[PDB]
Design a protein around this ligand. Structure first.
Ligand SMILES: [Zn+2]
Lengths: 150, 165
């Protein structure tokens, strides 16, 4: 998989009927389904995280995040697709590795940057004074759980 | 009349009363008696000594009346501020939170609910300056004793202090 990523780093149509014209675009169930750089790097970090190579996992995940967010200048480098996890389930997985490193003062510069971008959503918690009805996406409840373990 | 006589102390009279007549009625009388401006306030001054002397009746008093009544009791007679607050302190500390209904509730059926306790402190604060400071400080002190959390669901008393804005 490591090798995979560098592979995907590097990138003619005849006026004739060739085969690929008649070939389909493959599915996600295909063994010819290969995502993009970013999507994979995520796999690597994912797979790594399940094994218990937490530190390594982290570094992968940070590299993941570097890629996803910092990509203003070049060709865009995309997030993982939504049979997979959404952009906040990921940051969490970032911070969870950072906790299995014992990199807890990072794990917090993450859960800080998260709830800093996403202020401008959140539930503004006036039910705090009035105390089922308001809505909290699971991930915002959790950011707080892990800020905590940190 | 009994004061001028000095044969029996008002105490004995009010003890016998307490047995004899209907208590809810009685208390309201006494409550209002504490307030009537003077007619010869030795009268009011006697009732506070009776009350502070006998704790058990005074527990029922604070429990039976409305809030504004105890507020005015207090601002008039400061001898009642510190033990009344004492009784609230002592009721708050036999609650418990459940998470699933976002509310303080008591264990036992007779344990003055949240509703009632909010209200009386609501009032006591909604009072002249010489009591508001007293009570507000008596909150910050019982808060720190039960952990200085600044989030609900831990310290009954944090809860209250927040609930006052
Ligand atoms: Zn999600």
């Amino acid at each position: 998989l490591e090798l995979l990523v560098e592979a995907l780093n590097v990138p003619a149509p005849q006026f004739l009927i060739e085969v690929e014209l008649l070939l389909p675009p493959p599915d996600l169930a295909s063994p010819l389904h290969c995502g993009t750089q970013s999507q994979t790097k995520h796999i690597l970090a994912s797979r790594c995280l399940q094994t218990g190579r937490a530190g390594d996992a982290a570094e992968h995940y940070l590299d993941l995040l570097a890629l996803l967010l910092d990509s203003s200048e070049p060709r865009f480098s995309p997030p993982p697709s939504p049979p997979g996890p959404c952009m906040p389930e990921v940051f969490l997985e970032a911070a969870v590795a950072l906790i299995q490193a014992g990199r807890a003062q990072d794990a917090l510069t993450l859960c800080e940057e998260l709830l800093s971008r996403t202020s401008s959503l959140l539930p503004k918690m006036s039910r705090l004074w009035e105390d089922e009805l308001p809505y909290c996406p699971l991930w915002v409840s959790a950011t707080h759980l892990l800020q905590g373990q940190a | 009349e009994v004061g001028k006589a000095e044969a029996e102390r008002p105490a004995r009279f009010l003890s016998s009363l307490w047995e004899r007549l209907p208590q809810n009625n009685f208390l309201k009388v006494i409550a209002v008696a504490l307030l009537q401006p003077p007619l010869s306030g030795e009268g009011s001054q006697v009732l506070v000594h009776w009350l502070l002397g006998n704790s058990e009746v005074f527990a029922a008093f604070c429990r039976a009346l409305p809030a504004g009544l105890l507020t005015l009791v207090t601002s008039r007679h400061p001898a009642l501020s510190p033990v009344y607050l004492g009784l609230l302190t002592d009721w708050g500390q036999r609650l418990h939170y459940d998470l699933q209904k976002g509310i303080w509730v008591g264990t036992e059926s007779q344990d003055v609910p949240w509703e009632e306790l909010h209200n009386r402190f609501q009032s006591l604060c909604q009072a002249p300056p010489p009591l508001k400071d007293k009570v507000l400080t008596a909150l910050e002190t019982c808060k720190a004793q039960d952990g200085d959390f600044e989030v609900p669901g831990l310290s009954i008393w944090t809860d209250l202090l927040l609930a006052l804005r």
